[PDB]
């Protein structure tokens, strides 16, 4: 897979962010993560603040499409997002602010990696796992 440059335009919530990709604005849905709903579920606003802060403080944001379908039915890009080289999808799961989601249309490259971050968060009874 390859990382492509992007520019943060605006946070939306825990699992979604608006990015300038290839010169055009696009909404991205983070692959393989299921955060709590805000629009509220417990930790829903925590997840949103986390994603918002991580992308905001980042010097460089990168988009990494997986090997499966690249956009969902609502026109959102399906990818792994990196903030200064750190994967937000993974950071979220590791912080116990999101559960790993069902694989979607062959986009499973990082499933095990997130799977492990999640086991650890649960082991630490962190946030959602409290």
UniProtKB/Swiss-Prot annotation:
Q: Where does Ca(2+) bind?
A: 15, 34-35
Recorded E.C. number(s)? 3.1.31.1
Q: How is the cofactor bound?
A: Binds 1 Ca(2+) ion per subunit.
Q: Which reaction does it catalyse?
A: Endonucleolytic cleavage to nucleoside 3'-phosphates and 3'-phosphooligonucleotide end-products
Subcellular location as annotated: Secreted
| GO CC annotation, single | extracellular region
Q: Which Gene Ontology MF annotations are present?
A: endonuclease activity, active with either ribo- or deoxyribonucleic acids and producing 3'-phosphomonoesters; metal ion binding; nucleic acid binding
Q: Which cofactor does it need?
A: Ca(2+)
- Provide the active-site residues from the annotation: 29, 37, 76
Keywords from the UniProt entry: Calcium, Endonuclease, Hydrolase, Metal-binding, Nuclease, Secreted, Signal, Zymogen
Q: Which domain of life is it from?
A: Bacteria
**What does it do?**
Enzyme that catalyzes the hydrolysis of both DNA and RNA at the 5' position of the phosphodiester bond.
Q: What is this protein called?
A: Thermonuclease
Species assigned in the record: Staphylococcus aureus (strain MW2)
Q: Which gene encodes it?
A: nuc
Section of the entire sequence shown: 86 to 220 of 228
């Amino acid at each position: 897979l390859h990382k492509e440059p992007a520019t943060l335009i605006k946070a939306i919530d825990g699992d979604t962010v608006k990015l300038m990709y290839k010169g055009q604005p696009m909404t991205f849905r983070l692959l393989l993560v299921d955060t709590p709903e805000t629009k509220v579920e417990k930790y829903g606003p925590e997840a949103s603040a986390f994603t918002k802060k991580m992308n905001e403080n980042a010097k460089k944001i990168e988009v990494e499409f997986d090997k499966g379908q690249r956009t969902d039915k609502y026109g959102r890009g399906l990818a792994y997002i990196y903030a200064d080289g750190k994967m937000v999808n993974e950071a979220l799961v590791r912080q116990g602010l999101a559960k790993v989601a069902y694989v979607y249309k062959g986009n499973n490259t990082h499933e095990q990696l997130l799977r492990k971050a999640e086991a650890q968060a649960k082991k630490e009874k962190l946030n959602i796992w409290s």
